[PDB]
Amino acid sequence: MRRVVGKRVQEFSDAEFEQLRSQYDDVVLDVGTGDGKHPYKVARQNPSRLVVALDADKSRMEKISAKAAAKPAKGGLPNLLYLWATAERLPPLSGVGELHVLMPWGSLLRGVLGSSPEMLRGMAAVCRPGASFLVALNLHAWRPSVPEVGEHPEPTPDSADEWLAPRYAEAGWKLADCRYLEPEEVAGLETSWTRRLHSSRDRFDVLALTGTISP
Numbered sequence: 397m398r399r400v401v402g403k404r405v406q407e408f409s410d411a412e413f414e415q416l417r418s419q420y421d422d423v424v425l426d427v428g429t430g431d432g433k434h435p436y437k438v439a440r441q442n443p444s445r446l447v448v449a450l451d452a453d454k455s456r457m458e459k460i461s462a463k464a465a466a467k468p469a470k471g472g473l474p475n476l477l478y479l480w481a482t483a484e485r486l487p488p489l490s491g492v493g494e495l496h497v498l499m500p501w502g503s504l505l506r507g508v509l510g511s512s513p514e515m516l517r518g519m520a521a522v523c524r525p526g527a528s529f530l531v532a533l534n535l536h537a538w539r540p541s542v543p544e545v546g547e548h549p550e551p552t553p554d555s556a557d558e559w560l561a562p563r564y565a566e567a568g569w570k571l572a573d574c575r576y577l578e579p580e581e582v583a584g585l586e587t588s589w590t591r592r593l594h595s596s597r598d599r600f601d602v603l604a605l606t607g608t609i610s611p
């Protein structure tokens with residue numbers, strides 16, 4: 397595992413991770429965390445769970461990871477770990493209890509559309525059976541269609557129940573609910589995307605897919 401703290405990366409062992417995790421009730425993983433504001437909120441609000449967040453781009457996490465590693469009085473949080481990793485090559489995590497993928501783009505977005513099940517299966521691998529998941533799709537990936545969504549139509553609560561659920565099941569994800577999130581609900585997630593989306597004139601910008609990992 398490759399921990400990010402400010403501009404520093406430090407590899408550490410699975411054994412060290414296990415000792416850390418063993419002190420908490422459960423683990424939450426944010427995949428593609430970007431600037432890392434969301435997991436910082438999650439860790440702040442959930443002191444009894446260990447929050448792990450990763451991104452392919454280590455530079456994005458510099459500021460917040462440095463703050464999280466500081467003393468408590470300066471915004472430090474003991475239950476928050478930022479890692480440098482892609483969704484294609486996840487860290488050796490096991491038994492994650494809650495998985496978030498918020499506003500993905502690029503190969504992570506292609507992955508969560510499930511035309512191929514490999515990425516979904518790789519993410520399911522780090523989770524225990526019964527883990528909860530939230531995939532929050534940025535619908536602007538279809539406004540207009542970006543290269544990575546190919547010919548996929550923009551998903552809706554109904555259409556997702558139709559063509560996404562079967563794909564998720566093939567990959568071991570039980571898609572239980574699909575619904576639009578109000579802009580205020582998106583804002584509650586505390587991602588950097590709130591700012592980008594503030595100027596949107598669309599009714600909804602995000603579709604939330606939730607369920608459980610069921611291999």
Ligand SMILES: Nc1ncnc2c1ncn2[C@@H]1O[C@H](CSCC[C@H](N)C(=O)O)[C@@H](O)[C@H]1O
Nearest residue numbers: 428429430452482483498501502504587588
């Ligand atoms: N295959 C992949 N593996 C890991 N991260 C990926 C990825 N493909 C895209 N990403 C990352 O996913 C992020 C999408 S932007 C979303 C950032 C964050 N979830 C937020 O809501 O603010 C980007 O930071 C990008 O670097």
